[PDB]
Design an enzyme around this catalytic site. Structure first.
Site, PDB file in Angstrom:
ATOM      1  CG  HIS A   1      -0.364   0.147   2.522  1.00 49.65           C
ATOM      2  ND1 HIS A   1      -0.225  -0.912   3.393  1.00 49.65           N
ATOM      3  CD2 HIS A   1       0.118   1.232   3.172  1.00 49.65           C
ATOM      4  CE1 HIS A   1       0.333  -0.489   4.515  1.00 49.65           C
ATOM      5  NE2 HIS A   1       0.557   0.807   4.404  1.00 49.65           N
TER       6      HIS A   1
ATOM      7  N   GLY B   1       2.962   5.592  10.030  1.00 49.06           N
ATOM      8  CA  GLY B   1       4.305   5.501   9.502  1.00 49.06           C
ATOM      9  C   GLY B   1       5.091   4.280   9.929  1.00 49.06           C
TER      10      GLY B   1
ATOM     11  CB  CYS C   1       3.211   0.376   7.265  1.00 50.94           C
ATOM     12  SG  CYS C   1       1.566   0.105   7.919  1.00 50.94           S
TER      13      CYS C   1
HETATM   14  C1  LIG Z   1       1.069   1.840   8.102  1.00 51.19           C
HETATM   15  O1  LIG Z   1       2.128   2.640   8.605  1.00 51.19           O
HETATM   16  C2  LIG Z   1      -0.175   1.924   8.970  1.00 51.19           C
HETATM   17  C3  LIG Z   1       0.077   1.422  10.393  1.00 51.19           C
HETATM   18  C4  LIG Z   1      -1.099   1.774  11.303  1.00 51.19           C
HETATM   19  C5  LIG Z   1      -1.301   3.268  11.518  1.00 51.19           C
HETATM   20  C6  LIG Z   1      -1.926   3.363  12.901  1.00 51.19           C
HETATM   21  N1  LIG Z   1      -1.400   2.175  13.567  1.00 51.19           N
HETATM   22  C7  LIG Z   1      -0.982   1.239  12.720  1.00 51.19           C
HETATM   23  O2  LIG Z   1      -0.566   0.111  13.035  1.00 51.19           O
HETATM   24  N2  LIG Z   1      -1.255   1.158   8.347  1.00 51.19           N
HETATM   25  C8  LIG Z   1      -2.411   1.720   7.982  1.00 51.19           C
HETATM   26  O3  LIG Z   1      -2.660   2.907   8.179  1.00 51.19           O
HETATM   27  C9  LIG Z   1      -3.458   0.805   7.343  1.00 51.19           C
HETATM   28  C10 LIG Z   1      -3.466   0.968   5.823  1.00 51.19           C
HETATM   29  C11 LIG Z   1      -4.425   0.035   5.085  1.00 51.19           C
HETATM   30  C12 LIG Z   1      -4.089  -1.421   5.368  1.00 51.19           C
HETATM   31  C13 LIG Z   1      -4.405   0.306   3.587  1.00 51.19           C
HETATM   32  N3  LIG Z   1      -4.781   1.049   7.889  1.00 51.19           N
HETATM   33  C14 LIG Z   1      -4.993   0.925   9.210  1.00 51.19           C
HETATM   34  O4  LIG Z   1      -4.183   0.503  10.004  1.00 51.19           O
HETATM   35  O5  LIG Z   1      -6.178   1.468   9.559  1.00 51.19           O
HETATM   36  C15 LIG Z   1      -6.391   1.636  10.977  1.00 51.19           C
HETATM   37  C16 LIG Z   1      -7.767   2.246  11.176  1.00 51.19           C
HETATM   38  C17 LIG Z   1      -7.808   3.291  12.293  1.00 51.19           C
HETATM   39  C18 LIG Z   1      -8.401   2.544  13.485  1.00 51.19           C
HETATM   40  C19 LIG Z   1      -9.185   1.431  12.856  1.00 51.19           C
HETATM   41  O6  LIG Z   1     -10.077   0.770  13.381  1.00 51.19           O
HETATM   42  N4  LIG Z   1      -8.678   1.204  11.654  1.00 51.19           N
HETATM   43  C20 LIG Z   1      -9.009   0.031  10.865  1.00 51.19           C
HETATM   44  C21 LIG Z   1      -9.449   0.349   9.440  1.00 51.19           C
HETATM   45  C22 LIG Z   1     -10.887   0.824   9.249  1.00 51.19           C
HETATM   46  C23 LIG Z   1     -10.957   2.262   8.747  1.00 51.19           C
HETATM   47  C24 LIG Z   1     -12.398   2.723   8.543  1.00 51.19           C
HETATM   48  C25 LIG Z   1     -13.200   2.583   9.822  1.00 51.19           C
HETATM   49  C26 LIG Z   1     -13.153   1.155  10.332  1.00 51.19           C
HETATM   50  C27 LIG Z   1     -11.711   0.688  10.525  1.00 51.19           C
END
Ligand SMILES: *[C@H](O)[C@H](C[C@@H]1CCNC1=O)NC(=O)[C@H](CC(C)C)NC(=O)OC[C@@H]1CCC(=O)N1CCC1CCCCC1
Ligand SMILES: *[C@H](O)[C@H](C[C@@H]1CCNC1=O)NC(=O)[C@H](CC(C)C)NC(=O)OC[C@@H]1CCC(=O)N1CCC1CCCCC1
Lengths: 303, 303
Positions: A43, A145, A147
């Protein structure tokens, strides 16, 4: 009395030397640089407006080798190839990492512990150890950040990479990818609400913790009563415990303490109903974050 | 819901590059090699028959530079000078450590956290983080041969060495020396039974933990009732708590959550009498192993 148990991580230096920053357009995260290959979450190719419904196949086709920047902060690497494997990108760079350790790739199983190197912008910032939960999440500490942060175990001098961080779930826990590109669990690398499998107590780790208690002279919960492995596992399915599977590491603890596994399986069933105001190693609840291997190493000095 | 809090250690690579094995006769342990100096516990000079009543002054006079061997395992260093400072030896070697990081020496205070690199025979084997207890012990994980393992914090790129491991107490906890050679607490580096000062709850860390709970949406324990700092500290002296001293890090948490410190001081007094079957961040007892700095960094991303 202190149990002598701490959350113990591997020394992180070998893995720090492999950590890089990967940038793709407006997105940046961490990668792992081994030989001529840099692994990172796919991603990094996604712009912020498509994180909910990404088309990674089309995104990958839209990239060239010059779409990616790889930087080591603690040299800039020219990318000469790019490929996608599951939820990871495999970038090929023109410099082999001179600090590449002896390594393999492995998948970690529920109840097993591993060390995490949390990184931001290619810079390692902390290390901690987690246990893979039965629902294939970890109880980590990850911010925006992080990831591409990596989890690993170490056998001898060989690093066994098993995790690359991808996302945070709705309940605050975390999950990521194995280096074959599969996400742990049924999770997908999309920013949408996803079903969370129920977590469970890791029975083998609870057994290990009770052995650690005996090894520290705390054995009030030990009775001649015994529950068989098959009887306990039927009980476990109705009570949110993993089914118990014994190992040589557990048998060593039974031999050292003289307390049979089935005695502790019975104790777990009683302690699950309540500690009745008593404490085990400073706790009034069952502990499943310490493995039989942790107890053998930290208390008995057995590796 | 996971709090997002883990026991987080600094990346250990910078310190791994400074770790050596020191041998003196039949005794061997770990040393810390910085510039042209190697620090190690002085009881490396003691034969096993005198560990209870050592005369370190006479032992030091009986040594020459060739009495010591210093080896790096992950080069053999010629010792060209030796001196004793408190409970540590300062050996001078003829090679400056080419991997010497920017560093200082500091003393850690009760309630403050630091990272430990556990080593055996000059080989780093694990890392973990501990809080200096109010009785100047740490709840560590140390076995025979771990002496000379080092504790440190990191400010920017500067490593602040604060601990070198010396011994295990009768209750399973551990203590060691600051790099000025003073033992933490009233402890002596002799293998005899020693008085153990009573431990206490670290009030400022309990306050930080309750703020972490609020930051995770868990605030059932928050009431308009307030206990003043002076009133709480009088209460603390009779109830095995440290006296509370506020910091800028604590004030940031109050500002972020909108909950006054005095509200949590009142909550602590009530929670100390019992949680009444409720849980805070998965716990039925007060937690004092997380600092205000830990909460600011891990949850708010503030360093
Ligand atoms: C990468 O650096 C990042 C690591 C995250 C950021 C916060 N803590 C982490 O471990 N990864 C991401 O941001 C992911 C990207 C996707 C896989 C394309 N997304 C992610 O981690 O989303 C987290 C969000 C915020 C809290 C939550 O419940 N959640 C899950 C996703 C979804 C979003 C919409 C509402 C329901 C939950
Ligand atoms: C150095 O590697 C070593 C680290 C120890 C070994 C076990 N865990 C550790 O952290 N340090 C020592 O062995 C110490 C040497 C002295 C300071 C000269 N001694 C020490 O740690 O003794 C521990 C013993 C064993 C358990 C115990 O209560 N205890 C305290 C000393 C004393 C011995 C006599 C009976 C009362 C207690």
């Amino acid at each position: 009395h202190h149990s002598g148990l701490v959350k113990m991580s591997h020394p992180s230096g070998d893995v720090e030397a492999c950590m890089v920053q990967v940038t793709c357009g407006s997105m940046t995260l961490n990668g792992l640089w081994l030989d001529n290959t840099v692994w990172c979450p796919r991603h990094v190719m996604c712009p912020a407006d498509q994180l909910s419904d990404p088309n990674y196949d089309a995104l990958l086709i839209s990239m060239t080798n010059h779409s990616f920047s790889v930087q080591k902060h603690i040299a800039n690497l020219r990318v000469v190839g790019h490929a996608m494997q599951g939820t990871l990108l495999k970038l090929t760079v023109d410099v082999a990492n001179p600090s590449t350790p002896a390594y393999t790739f492995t998948t970690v199983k529920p109840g097993a512990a591993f060390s995490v190197l949390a990184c931001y912008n290619g810079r390692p910032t902390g290390t901690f150890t987690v246990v893979m939960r039965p629902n294939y999440t970890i109880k980590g500490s990850f911010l925006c950040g992080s990831c591409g942060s990596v989890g690993y175990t170490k056998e001898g001098s060989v690093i066994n990479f098993c995790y690359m961080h991808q996302m945070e779930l709705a309940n605050g826990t975390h999950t990521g990818s194995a280096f074959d590109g599969t996400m742990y669990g049924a999770f997908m690398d999309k920013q949408v609400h996803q079903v969370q499998l129920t977590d469970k107590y890791c029975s083998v780790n609870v057994v290990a913790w009770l052995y650690a208690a005996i090894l520290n002279g705390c054995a009030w919960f030990v009775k001649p009563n015994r529950t068989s492995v098959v009887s306990f596992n039927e009980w476990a399915l109705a009570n949110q415990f993993t089914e118990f599977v014994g190992t040589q590491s557990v048998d060593m603890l039974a031999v050292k303490t003289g307390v049979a596994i089935e005695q502790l399986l019975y104790a777990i069933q009683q302690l699950y109903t309540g500690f009745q105001g008593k404490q085990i190693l400073g706790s009034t609840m069952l502990e499943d974050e310490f493995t039989p291997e942790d107890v053998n190493m930290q208390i008995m000095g057995v590796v």
